[PDB]
Amino acid sequence: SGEYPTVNEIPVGEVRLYQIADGVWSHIATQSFDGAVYPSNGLIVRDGDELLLIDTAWGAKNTAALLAEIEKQIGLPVTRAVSTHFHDDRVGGVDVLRAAGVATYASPSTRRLAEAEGNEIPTHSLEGLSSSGDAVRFGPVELFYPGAAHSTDNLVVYVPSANVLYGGCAVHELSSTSAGNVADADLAEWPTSVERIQKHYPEAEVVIPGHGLPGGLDLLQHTANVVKAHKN
Ligand SMILES: Cc1nc([C@@H](C)c2cccc3c(-c4ccc(CS(C)(=O)=O)c(F)c4)c(C(=O)O)[nH]c23)no1
Ligand SMILES: [Zn+2]
Ligand SMILES: [Zn+2]
């Protein structure tokens, strides 16, 4: 009833939306992985009379539920989606999107890693993002490649109209006590990549992590701190 929805408040298979700013929502879903349940976030950005989706809801059935929740709460069609890295919490559900008329996009690096891992593969490649510090416009957002962090391919997303920074899984929530799932991470490079985010988006007002509660710019320094300590 108004607070940001937490892992224990969302059964696996349901999706909730949360209004972040005018024309900007996050989507929250839950999934089981290796015998534990986790929440995960994505983004929805109004694009005139259409919507841009950032990340799936972590699975085919959750992503179908996401589309139904968007129709109920917003009522505008999702026409494009971007996946910010290759893991299943970002691309799982791309096939559902593609069958619902959504054009799916990711960097070439994400597409090659998703294919090699056996995950669902976005249709279209996003060029111009292969060197750290690169940025491109995509509808109402800017896509930014900060360098290797949670994964080598991770992208962050900025909504300039609202100064919303969606960090994806390169950014952790303030309550986090470790660096999450580090299977594909570069712990040594991650603080440098976070510093690039901090330098490029100093006017961010809301920062959304890939899992957990949004906050302010402090999430970036907190992420650097937990990553350095995990590595140690
Ligand atoms: C292989 C491979 N599969 C995956 C994905 C699908 C995956 C599965 C299960 C869990 C996660 C997490 C995760 C874990 C713990 C915390 C709490 S915390 C910051 O306090 O430790 C958290 F916030 C997030 C992440 C992420 O860190 O992005 N990804 C995950 N990744 O690699
Ligand atoms: Zn991941
Ligand atoms: Zn993640």
Automatic annotation (TrEMBL):
Zn(2+) 4 binds at residues 125, 127. It catalyses: a beta-lactam + H2O = a substituted beta-amino acid. The keyword Electron transport does not apply. Keywords: Antibiotic resistance, Hydrolase, Metal-binding, Periplasm, Plasmid, Signal, Zinc. It holds the Pfam family Lactamase_B. Belongs to the metallo-beta-lactamase superfamily. Class-B beta-lactamase family. PANTHER family: ACYL-COENZYME A THIOESTERASE MBLAC2, METALLO-BETA-LACTAMASE DOMAIN-CONTAINING. This is beta-lactamase. It comes from Pseudomonas aeruginosa.
